[PDB]
């Protein structure tokens, strides 16, 4: 029994890491989103003076 | 005496004003980038 409550609560904390993951990808990506507008801006305005 | 070269001198205050405004339109996109990419973090915090 031991080993199995042992298990589980490692389950669930691995659980909980992996949402948290989950989290800091998903602001990585907004920042790498952020980064993309103003890259294609660029890329327009680079066009523009070409 | 009048000014030498009247047209010149005005074209370059109108090079400074429309500078100067280029630069605040400028920043003005910059603080939008910004304040969209902290409003979406919170919401991830």
Redesign the interface.
């Known amino acids: 029994a031991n080993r199995f409550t042992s298990n589980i609560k490692g389950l669930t904390q691995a659980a909980r890491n992996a949402n948290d993951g989950i989290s800091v990808a998903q602001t990585t990506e907004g920042a790498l989103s952020e980064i993309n507008n103003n890259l294609q801006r660029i890329r327009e305005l680079t066009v523009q003076a070409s | 005496e009048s000014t030498s070269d009247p047209l010149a001198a005005l074209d370059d205050a109108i090079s400074q004003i429309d500078k100067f405004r280029s630069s605040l339109g400028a920043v003005q996109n910059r603080l939008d980038?910004a304040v969209?990419?902290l409003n979406?973090?919170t919401t991830?915090?």
Do not use: E, G, Q
């Open positions: 980038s969209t990419n979406n973090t991830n915090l």
